[PDB]
Structure formats: C-alpha cells, structure tokens
Symmetry: D2
Subunit: 329 residues, 4 copies
C-alpha cells in the first residue's frame, strides 16, 4: 500500500514514524507548506518522541528516508497535488483543513483512490474506530478516524456496554497540551479559556468525543457526554468515565471483562494494567486505550468510575495506519 | 483571640498571612524546627503568593511582624511548648504529626485552651467545614478543619443535596502539586505513584475527601466516593462531581441554586462564576468552593457533572481561622 | 498626558495596568483586532499578574475602566486611527508591526503628536533606556524603548563601565517563555529552535540586546555581545554578564557601586538585593534591573560574572510610561 | 567484571540500565533501603528514560533482570554488605553518603576490591574524568568520577586549553531539576534558594564544578570558577563557558578543534553538532559533553562563549562504568 501524507504536523509526523515500522504501508509523498530541509529537521528531532530511528537526508528538494525517496510538495490547494505521479492509493488528511467530503474529495480528483481524515468529520463522512466499528466499514472512499479521545473512550465503552449495559455516562478527559494552545495568555477568539497560558493552568475545555461515541457505537447514542481539562503536560492524556450499569457488576468483574478484551478480540487496541502507572509510562503507547485497574473506583455495583490512558499522538497515529490498511483489504 | 501556630509549612505560613488581615485574631507564637531568620525568609518570599505585604525583622531570636513580636520556638514535643507565657487561646496544629486526641491534647496541657487541626482527623476528633456543619459545633476543645478537597466538595454537595437530593456521586479532583511529591522519580514507599516526577506526570492518587463528606454531612454518608489526579501546577485545584439527583433539575436550576447560596447563607464560602476562568484566576481565592457554571455539563435532568475550583492553600487557611473564631464565640 | 495604545498584547495590557496607578498619564483609546468584550476579559484575568485591580465593563462597544471610558477600535491600517477625536498626545506602538519611521509616522498623520515603540527599532529610530540615556533625548517625535533585555543590561552596564571601565563583555540571558514560542514542537521557519516545545526545553536563542547597548551607551559600542536560553517559566528573566574590567575592583566594590546607583541617581530603575531570591520573587518588579549580589561571582579583580533579574513584562511596561512622560516634558 | 551498586537512586538506576548494554560489566548485587519489589518498579518505569528494555521479576526477595539474578540487600552500614558472597570486583558508591576514604573503604573491608564514587570527593580521594585524566590513573583502589557538570566542562576545557590556552574562564550551567529540590516552597536549611518551588523558578545555585576542573586538569587550576541556574526541566543541562584565550582563534578554528577531538581521541566523550538542537534532543546522550556550534558566540578572537550540552544522568552514568572498566584493566 502506497500512501501520501498531507500536513506534516504532530499527527502527520508520527503517522510517518509509525509507518516506517510496518511492512504493508509505504509513505511515498508528503505535502506541507514548509521547505523539505525544515521538514527533515522536524522529523529527525522531536521533544516528545526522541530522535528519529533512521536516516534522513535532503536531495534535490526531496526527502530520502531510510534509502527511500519521498516526493515533497508545498501545494495549498488539494486539487493540485498530482497524486498520480507517485501512485498513492490512500491519502492521510492530517492538515485539519479538509474534514468534509468536498474538501477531501479533491485528493481523489488528484489521483488518490481513498483518503483517511486524521480528525473527526465535520459533515456526515463516516467515522471508524478500531475496536469499535472497523467491522462496519462498507467500502466508502473517504473516512474519518475520529479523534484521540474517541479512540480511547469507544473501545472501553464497548466492552462495558456489551458486558453490563451502559444506562448513562459522564466523561472527563485530563488532556495534555496540544498545538492549539498558547505559551502565555494570548488571543483565542473562539475559545477564551484555550488562549490562557497552558503551562500555568488547568484549562476547562469542551469536547465532542463522548457524544461522538454514539456515532461509532449507535447503541450508546445519546447516553454519553463529557468535558475536558487541559493540563501542562506535553503528551499522554487520560479518560475518566463515570457510568451507570443496568446489570450489577463488582469492580473485579469489570477488571476481568476489560482484561479479557485486552487479551482477546481487542488485543493491541485496548490495554490493561494493574501497575502504579503515571502518564509518562504511556509515552509511546500503541494501544489507544489502556485501562488503569487500580486508579478506578466503584461506589456500588451499578455506579463506577473507570480510568484509561492514551498517548494522544502515538495511539491515534498507529490506528490511522490500521484504518488505511483496513480500507485497502 | 490570641493564637499560636505549630508548623510553619505551606498551611501554617498562609494561615499566618491571612490572620494579618483580620481584626479578631492575633498570632502571638510560632513553633517549627527552623531558625527564626529562616522562618522570616519563608514568610517574606513565596513563589505562589508573592512577597509578604508587611514588615518582617528578626530581633533576639524572635520575629517582629508589622511591629508585633511573635515568640519563636523549636520544640519537637508538644508537651513542652509552654503556651501559658504568651497566653494563647487556640492553637493551629499545622505540622500534620498530631491528628489524634492524645497527640493534640499536649497543646492543652501546655497551656492552650483549644486546638484546631489543619488536616483531617485520624481518630474520631470531630471535623467541621464552613458551609457544611459549623452550626453543629458542640463546644469540643479539639477539632479538625477536614482537608482542602472536603472544604470544596462539602458546601457544593450540601447545596445540591438540599435542593435536589443526591442519590449517589462520584468525584474526581484535579489537584495541584503539593509538598508530598517529588521533583524527579524518587522514593515514596507508601504511595508508589506519588513518588514519580510531579512536573512530568499526571499522577492518579487516592483521596478520602468524598467519603469524609459523609462525616460533615451525615445525610450523604455512604453516597460519595472519589479519586484524584495530581497535575504539574503549583497551586489551585478543581473538583469534578458527577451526581445522580432524585429530583429532576435542569442545569439552569442547578446554576440558580448554587448562585443563590453563593449570594446568601454561604456568601464567602461558596463562590459562583459564569466567566471563562482557568486555574490561575483563583490564586488567592478566599472562597473554599467556586462553582464553574460553564465548565459543568448535564447529560439529563438527573445526571450531571459539576465543576468547582479551590485554592488548596488560601481557601483552606482562611477557613482554619474562621473555625478558630467560631469555636471562640 | 493622554495616550492611546495600539496592540492589546502582553505589553499593551500591562502598560495599561501600570498606567492606572499613575497621575500623569491617562489611557483614552485602545486599538486591536479583537472585540471589546474579549479585550475586557484579557484585561480582567491574567495568569501571570492576577486579576485586574479595578472595574471593567463594556458599554456600546467601548470599555469603561474605573469609571473612565476608553475608545475601542479595530483598524488594521494605522493611518485610519483618527487619533484626533479622543485627543491623544503620545501613542504606545505595542503591535510589533510598526518599528520603522514610515510605519509609526502614520500614527502622527492620524492625529497623535508623538509615538513610543514598545520594541527595538528596525531602522535608525533613536532608542532610549531609562538609567542609560533618557537625558540624551533631543525632542524627536518617534522613539523606541529598546527591549526587555536591554533595559536590564544597559543600567547595570553603565554603572560597571562608569566606575571600572568595561574592556569587553559576554552576556547570557536566561529568558522566560514568551508569546512567540510553541506549546509543542511546531513550525517556526525563521528560528527552528524557537519552534520546539517551550515547556519541555531549554532553547538557545539569538539576541541583539548586548549589541544594542552600544547604541544607548556609545562608550560600550562593539564591546558586548551575547545570546539567550529560553526556559519553561512564564515570566521573569535574568541577565548573566561576564565582563573584563580595566580597573581592578573586588566584588565588594562592585556591590557597593551598584547599591549606590540603586539608592541614588538610578533609584527605581536599578535595584539591589543580597537576599536568597529566585525568579518568582520579581514577578511584578518595577525596577528594570535588580542586581543579585550573592548570585554573582568573581574569578579575580578584573574578571567577574554579574547577575541581574528583570520582569520582562512589568519593568519594561513601566519604563515605556516613563519614556512617554519624559518625551512630554 | 562483576560490580555491585549501593544506592538505587537516579544515578544507581541508570548505571544499572547502561550496564545491561555492556559486555564487560555484570551487575550482580544492589543495596538500598527499599524492598526488592519497589526497586523492581523503579527500574521498570522511569518518567525520563521510559520503560526498562528488558525483563524484571522478583523471586524470593531478589531481582531477576534479563534472566540473571541480582542479590538485593538493605544494609545501612557499608561494613555489613558481605560483598564476598556474590564476588564483586568494583562497587559503585551511588548513595552520596560515603564520599571519603574511611566511608567507602568499608566496601573494601566487606570484600570488594575497588570502589568508584558516583560523586565528587569530599576529602582528597582522586577524581577522574574521561577525556580529562583517565590516563593518569595510578592504580588507586578508591576513586571518584567527579560530578555531572565537571564531566561536561573538563573535556571541553581540555580541548580549548590545549589548542589555544585558557587564561581565565567563567562558567554558568543551566541545570535541570534534581532530586535535591522541592515541588513547592519548602525547607532547605543549607541552601535557602534550593528550597523554593523548582517548577516555578529559575533558581541560582552554587557549584564547584568549575574549580574542580583544576583538579582533573592541573593546568587550569585557579583559572575557572562558576555558578548555576536551576530551571524547571526534568533532565539535560547545558554549560555556558566564557573564556579568554592567550592565542587568537576565530570561532571556526574553535569549531574545527572541538570537532576534531569529538571525531578523534575524544570520540564518544566529547560530541559536536551544528544542528538547531534543544535540550530534549540530548535525553539519552551518552557523550558527556556535546558542543553546540551554533549556540556559541565570539566577541573577538580572544574572548568567546562556548555552549555544551549534557544529559546529567545518562552521560555521567555511562562514564561511571567506563571508569569501572578502566580501573580494572
């Protein structure tokens, strides 16, 4: 599978890094508004993920990564990208600018066969989350991989709902700082809290991840909503899910049910630990949802708070590639 | 009212600072294992609360704060403190070492009339929280002011339970870093997570504040439990309370009920805002519980998540003085 | 003196705050690309400087601060500002966009008499630094107040050079995070280091402050150069000046010389301490240069390293107002 | 070579981790005041260095790391350690408690042949720094590896002094937070600045590393002194060396001289880069001194400021093992 990346931001770069360790996917082209030498620097050095484990060199305005040449472009309009030349099958839409059908379809008019959006859709483009509803993919040519937080919540919510039935749930994610935030108090006209200094503050934030679960798991439609707190850590976030269960279930039953999925049909997607973990212990986590057995607490058999960690860059990026491979089957 | 402080830590120092702005309470003596010149330095400069707004000088091994002399001691055993000489009525027990009756009663054998513990009791010493059960004080000579988090949760929980009836509740506090934590990964044998580097990590932590509410509000006994996440901020924390209500209540009804208490019988204890606040906006907050109207969210009329901020040093310290004045009436 | 502010960023906002405490300067108009209600929010709440100590209300698209009305505008081109109507004498150019003569002169064509740039000039507009060369102002109608770091270095360098003669000097400033930096690794095409996550990194950075001293103190022209390290603190920076002296001088002679200037002709500009200060102890410092007596060290009588703190927002902003008042004499 | 570690702190743990990747050194025993299961947890998870790349299991109160058994002890007095049983040749003294001859010689009375202190000596025990004076080791049975900062400064200083002659030098290290510091303002009676909150502050600090260079490089005795600034980063520090050269030398000559040593006789000790690096780019750096070519600046041919990075844990730990192997030749 030959794939091109549009947007070499946080997600595009780690999608690129993760794709190197895969045998079924080849990155052949990248498009961003930055020169290739700068793109090389951003790939070689990363304050969160360490130095690139490979070779990066610039030759004639293009990138040579581990011997393979990657066509570099800097086109602003996605109709122009000429995806035909390097022969790309799927395009990873990681700019955040093109989250509709008409936006991303310009990739298909430019020669790509299918595209995966590295963010939640803004129209009705179908969203797919591994562990949740990958098995419901119906050959659509443009898909969304939802968001970091949905990829953490949905697999956990599916296991809980399938074994015990979620009547209703309220969610809080304690989220690491992201590129949208400011170093000091600065302008953020659509989200006033979000403009305050990120390193000084716990910042409440809205989120649609809890309701978006209703789209990937229609059973839970209208039963979850939530919010977020942004805190001054560079990476790794944690979901705090408070749910009511129709079927009584002790905490040990919940642990066993999650551990079973983590070792079975959801291996590599849902993780499970009983160790004294903290957030940095998941820097690099490929699982999109690691259940923290000892951090959760139950008030009784039908009212429980469940905790699950996610590397909001590494897990999401690896599942973007899983979605790319899945829609290419 | 003449008061002595034992333990010049974070809480003892800000209890001292807040007492300066009061007309009914006079700090006359301090006891800690540190020299008086060092105690002066820790009072003059504070990375969180800024420079002391007053004069501090050391004369003959004692402190002269705003002209008044304060007797400085360095006795390890509380029987020795000779509280008689400077004539102290109430002693603020801020070391954390003496949270029983037999521990703190050595202050009373040393000449003090009553003592207030600046932390949750470990035996059955009664706890009192302003807004919750100050009106139930029955002349006891040794009392506890509970904890920072209880002082935030209990006034909010009382308003919600009195107007709508809490069936059950699960609580998460996103807590600022405290003195118990480590700068880098270091030994913490009773709490392994708590020893991990505080500036790098979201650290899950246990808490008894949600169950302790059942002690100050016996109606809620057995209906709340919770947990905590420690995050790399220096001060100010936030409570996230997910509750089921027996009586249906829209979010606007909850806002109006909390705002009414904040402007009425709980003025100065419970606060209320609809602004786009972040945590630093409450650095120095005297209210022990500031309801964040826009950060909270309701799934339906009986299942809601409520958010309330607290300066875990300033609010708690001011209410320690309120408890000292209350038990002296 | 009636003054208008263009650009309500970090510097414009704290220039506004500091002007409130002055009897000779009245802010009558503000111009920024933000709505007035948002500008009110950014004035009321500040993660570094706390809540505004006054009243802010929005009435008919304008700001009412402490009873006084302030004309709010949102004009992108400075020719349009119509400074005549509210009758402004001096304009504080705090956008950073207009650091030439032709740029800022559009303020004078718009009705203002003089303008002060809140940043170093890019052409040959004269720069003035209090303690350095305010006494050399020659009635020019457009001036620059240099930069935060120059306002710290120049008064210290003048005292050292006047008493002992600086042969040569190398400077390092350990600088707090600023609005130009990123929360996580992100694009910064003109300064690749500057785009790396600010909270995770010590970031080396270029600086022209050491050479710019040669402009405000022509004696030191060509004798100083330097560099910077950006570190994850929100405010307050520190200059580390390594100099060779022609005249031998013990460290105690240097302390006495700096203390003399701090208590004499440079009172309120240059500060002096021998206390165990850290950076937060200067959050709010009005002095642009506080000599740290105990942090400095001498190798011998002619080779010494001198340390001086500055609040890169508060000191600079207060001296912008001092320059405004000085050019209005 | 069989080696035992005393003290499983930051340095002891990373000495252990680095020793795993070596063929000449085998860790056979560890001694600390912590249970073996806790020691396992501290080895498996590290907020700065990630998860251990190997297997850790506890069997009968001992550690099994990568199949090999390691004898765990918890003896407070080093005479008791019975180093004979597991047959250890060299002991790494990483507690910081035993930095004299009489202190550490109890390891030799306990069966060890030689000991290496993972810190600067407090008596006259010889210090050795790779790149500086490893070739001057004279068969002594107890040695010190100096400090993190000396291991960065000395190799750089040797190259500069050997090629150009250092007349005099002043040094500043911008140092990451260490275990000695506090999360919030707390007691530190021997260093008042050092007790202030580490995440909020730039903290000036004393250092003996610049003078200690005179011990490992007797030519530079009395020609260097310095200071430090502690900043809120978890790991990696940087040396800023301002020197006068007797022999004129352009900056490009200095770059070429350092690059030559980094590629020649000091390969693996002294590193060299011209890239736009920041501190996280050296998390895991094995070189004890990486010259930052573009961060340094020269005022003229005889007065220059040189910048060099070091991972204060990883570089130092790897050279502790190099010293252990060197004294075993």
């Amino acid at each position: 599978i030959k794939v091109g990346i549009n947007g070499f931001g946080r997600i595009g770069r780690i999608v690129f890094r993760a794709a190197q360790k895969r045998s079924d996917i080849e990155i052949v082209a990248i498009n961003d508004l930055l020169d290739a030498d700068y793109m090389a620097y951003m790939l070689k050095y990363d304050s969160t993920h360490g130095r690139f484990d490979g070779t990066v060199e610039v030759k004639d305005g293009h990138l040579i990564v581990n011997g393979k040449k990657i066509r570099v472009t800097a086109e602003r309009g996605p109709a122009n990208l000429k995806w035909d030349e390097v022969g790309v099958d799927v395009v990873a839409e990681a700019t955040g600018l093109f989250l509709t059908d008409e936006t991303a379809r310009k990739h298909i008019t430019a020669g790509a066969k299918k595209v995966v959006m590295t963010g939640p859709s803004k129209d009705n483009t179908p969203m797919f989350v591994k562990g949740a509803n990958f098995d419901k993919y119906a050959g659509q040519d443009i898909v969304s991989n939802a968001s970091c937080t949905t990829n953490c919540l949905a697999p956990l919510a599916k296991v809980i709902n399938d074994n015990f039935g979620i009547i209703e749930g309220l969610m809080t994610t304690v989220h690491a700082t992201t590129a949208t935030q400011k170093t000091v108090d600065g302008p953020s006209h659509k989200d006033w809290r979000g403009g305050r200094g990120a390193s000084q503050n716990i910042i409440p934030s809205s989120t649609g991840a809890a309701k978006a679960v209703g789209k990937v798991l229609p059973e839970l439609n209208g039963k979850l909503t939530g919010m977020a707190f942004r805190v001054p850590t560079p990476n790794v976030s944690v979901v705090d899910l408070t749910v009511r269960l129709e079927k009584a279930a002790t905490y040990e039953q919940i642990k066993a049910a999650v551990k079973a999925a983590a070792e079975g049909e959801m291996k590599g997607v849902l993780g499970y630990t009983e160790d004294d973990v903290v957030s940095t212990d998941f820097n690099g986590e490929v699982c999109t949802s690691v259940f923290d057995a000892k951090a959760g607490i139950a008030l009784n058999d039908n009212f429980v708070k469940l905790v699950s960690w996610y590397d909001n860059e590494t897990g999401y990026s690896n599942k973007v590639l899983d979605l790319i491979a899945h829609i290419s089957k």
